[PDB]
Structure 1
Amino acid sequence: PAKRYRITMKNLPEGCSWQDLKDLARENSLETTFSSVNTRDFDGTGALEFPSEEILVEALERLNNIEFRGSVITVERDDN
């Protein structure tokens, strides 16, 4: 729509899953459309999408190098 973006949500010790990352994201105030998770990286990173950069910039300032129930995630723009 007004936008289309994709972000990475990742760090190193955590093979996170879509259920896990949406759980945290709702904790944190994200929602998004969806995320590319479970497939491969070091083992398991997510990569979210939304039609409006509000949600992108949010996580880039809400989830960037945050501790995730005892793991951590670093998050960033990945198609922009």
Structure 2
Amino acid sequence: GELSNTRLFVRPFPLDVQESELNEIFGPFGPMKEVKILNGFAFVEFEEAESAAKAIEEVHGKSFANQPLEVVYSKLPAKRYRITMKNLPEGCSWQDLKDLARENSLETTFSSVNTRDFDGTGALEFPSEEILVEALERLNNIEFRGSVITVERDDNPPPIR
């Protein structure tokens, strides 16, 4: 096999979505074999697997256009251990959900919430499936602050293309 090795998928950039920024950003990483910038998604293929593998862990989590950047290995996996919550109109936050989660016999490695809007929805992930299914069945349909919160897994693996 010679597929996955040099290709990093970036998030959608604003009106400033051009190779100019991609080069000025991914520049200090290695000889970019090629670059792609489309309204909605970006891609960058390095001439060296190392340069790519690094840029993926470097660029990922960066800042640009007053927004958090995101980069990954242009590719798709299978199965996961994360779930999303709904009907949770509360402030908690990652710290809150993480506190109750760990206290409820549920260890998580990643957490996220949505405070920007009043949708009242969050998302958590566990290191193992056991905790996922357990926490999902233990959290599914629960009364809290006079509100019934529910948890449901949501897998969104990029199209096969």
Match of 1:32 in 2: 108
* 3-state SS of paired residue (2:88): coil
* Inter-partner Cα distance in structure 1 for 2:152 and 2:121: 12
For structure 1, which segment, 57-66 or 32-41, has the greater mean C-alpha deviation from structure 2 after superposition? 32-41
* Inter-partner Cα distance in structure 1 for 2:82 and 2:113: 12
Deviation at 1:50, TM superposition (A): 2.6
Deviation at 1:21, TM superposition (A): 0.6
Match of 1:8 in 2: 84
Q: Which has the larger Rg?
A: 2
Deviation at 1:4, TM superposition (A): 2.8
Deviation at 1:13, TM superposition (A): 2.7
Give the structure, 1 or 2, with the largest relative contact order (CA under 8 Å, sep 6 or more): 1
Structure 1: any 5+ residue segments left out of the alignment?
Answer: none
For structure 1, which segment, 44-53 or 17-26, has the greater mean C-alpha deviation from structure 2 after superposition? 44-53
What do the CA deviations read for 1:1-34 (whole angstroms, capped 9, x no partner)? 9963320123143243111111221232111111
Q: Flag the 1:73–1:27 CA change in 2: closer, same or farther, 3 A.
A: farther
* Inter-partner Cα distance in structure 2 for 1:24 and 1:79: 24
* Inter-partner Cα distance in structure 1 for 2:99 and 2:143: 13
Q: Please tell me whether the aligned partners of residues 141 and 151 of structure 2 are also in contact (alpha carbons under 8 angstroms).
A: yes
Q: Flag the 1:8–1:54 CA change in 2: closer, same or farther, 3 A.
A: same
Q: Please tell me whether the aligned partners of residues 6 and 77 of structure 1 are also in contact (alpha carbons under 8 angstroms).
A: yes
What do the CA deviations read for 1:27-72 (whole angstroms, capped 9, x no partner)? 3211111112245453443211134211110112111111336554
Structure 2: any 5+ residue segments left out of the alignment?
Answer: 1-76, 157-161
Q: Flag the 1:39–1:13 CA change in 2: closer, same or farther, 3 A.
A: closer
Deviation at 1:76, TM superposition (A): 1.2
What's the Cα RMSD here?
2.9
- TM-score w.r.t. length of structure 2: 0.40
* Inter-partner Cα distance in structure 2 for 1:20 and 1:8: 15
How many residues in Structure 1 have an aligned counterpart in Structure 2?
80
- TM-score w.r.t. length of structure 1: 0.70
* 3-state SS of paired residue (2:90): coil
